[PDB]
Amino acid sequence: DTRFHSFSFYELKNVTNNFDERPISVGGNKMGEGGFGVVYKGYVNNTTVAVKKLAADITTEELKQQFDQEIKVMAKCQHENLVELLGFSSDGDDLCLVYVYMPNGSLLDRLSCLDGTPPLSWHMRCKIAQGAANGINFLHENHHIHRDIKSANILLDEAFTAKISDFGLARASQTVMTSRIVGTTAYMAPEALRGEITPKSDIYSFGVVLLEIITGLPAVDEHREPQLLLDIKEEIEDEEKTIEDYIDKKMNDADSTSVEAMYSVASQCLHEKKNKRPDIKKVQQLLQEMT
Numbered sequence: 143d144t145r146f147h148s149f150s151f152y153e154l155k156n157v158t159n160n161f162d163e164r165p166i167s168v169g170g171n172k173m174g175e176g177g178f179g180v181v182y183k184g185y186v187n188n189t190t191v192a193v194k195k196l197a198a199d200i201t202t203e204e205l206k207q208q209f210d211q212e213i214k215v216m217a218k219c220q221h222e223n224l225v226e227l228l229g230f231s232s233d234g235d236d237l238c239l240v241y242v243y244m245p246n247g248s249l250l251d252r253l254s255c256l257d258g259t260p261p262l263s264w265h266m267r268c269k270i271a272q273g274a275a276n277g278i279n280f281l282h283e284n285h286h287i288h289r290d291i292k293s294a295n296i297l298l299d300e301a302f303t304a305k306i307s308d309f310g311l312a313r314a315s316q317t318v319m320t321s322r323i324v325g326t327t328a329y330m331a332p333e334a335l336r337g338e339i340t341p342k343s344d345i346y347s348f349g350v351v352l353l354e355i356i357t358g359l360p361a362v363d364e365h366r367e368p369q370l371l372l373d374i375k376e377e378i379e380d381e382e383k384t385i386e387d388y389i390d391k392k393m394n395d396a397d398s399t400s401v402e403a404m405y406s407v408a409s410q411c412l413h414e415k416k417n418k419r420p421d422i423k424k425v426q427q428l429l430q431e432m433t
């Protein structure tokens with residue numbers, strides 16, 4: 143098991159400049175956020191780190207469970223396509239998780255060219271998809287269901303190696319149900335939206351990510367018609383549209399054969415009936431044959 147450093151909260155306040163909320167793009171410390179909390183940049187002993195400060199739908203006890211679960215999963219799972227936890231703080235009424243900093247942020251943000259990063263090439267997108275599937279495969283081989291696969295949780299290091307993140311909702315792998323449905327609605331399998339817990343839902347959410355990679359479009363955009371990227375996929379499969387109509391135009395190296403090949407993988411991942419989807423091992427093989 144990996145051993146982690148227990149920081150005092152006041153130390154993490156110092157390294158994040160008191161959790162400075164200005165974007166790092168203008169010299170602040172804020173890197174991203176959501177319902178989970180906020181992630182900040184800092185330096186610990188010259189090491190660049192990401193500090194996730196958890197925010198309070200969920201009881202304090204429940205939030206503590208997700209904090210404990212992330213530490214337990216990260217203690218057991220070390221792999222080059224997973225992020226790496228360094229430490230944590232839990233003194234007082236705050237919970238912080240400290241990771242090795244990811245120089246290229248999230249896949250979601252690089253697909254939207256947030257803060258002016260250059261568009262990803264098709265060649266790079268294929269390698270990122272393969273890397274992400276390799277990380278999910280490691281998780282599933284070690285009997286963890288992620289439950290929140292999405293492009294915001296696929297991070298990118300300096301060489302754009304893909305790294306799965308956010309294991310606070312992970313569960314061990316009859317039909318297992320829960321009374322507390324969690325996840326990000328635009329990526330979830332239908333059975334996951336109704337309380338089922340199964341690794342086959344990770345495959346469905348990964349299919350949505352493949353659509354984000356092909357199109358450059360986020361899974362949901364309230365200002366778009368259709369708002370949901372899954373609705374766009376139904377227009378293709380019902381033949382009013384083709385996947386070539388939606389290929390990201392911010393690419394100059396997308397050949398149609400491999401694009402249709404990864405769309406084929408996504409379409410198999412997106413089967414409504416969970417038992418017709420490939421398992422992650424098959425998804426790995428299909429993505430390797432595409433390149």
Ligand SMILES: CC(C)(O)[C@H](F)CNC(=O)c1cnc(-c2ccc3cc(C#N)cnn23)cc1N[C@H]1CC[C@H](c2cnn(C(F)F)c2)CC1
Pocket residue numbers: 173174175176177178181191192194225226241242243244245246247248251257259294295297307308309
């Ligand atoms: C191009 C640049 C120079 O600007 C470049 F980008 C800067 N580097 C970063 O920005 C950045 C750097 N290292 C991390 C990092 C490393 C390990 C972990 C683990 C965990 C968890 N657990 C979260 N981060 N992390 C994350 C980063 N950025 C995320 C973007 C997505 C955000 C997010 C997650 N979910 N949501 C929403 F869907 F809820 C939004 C969270 C921060």
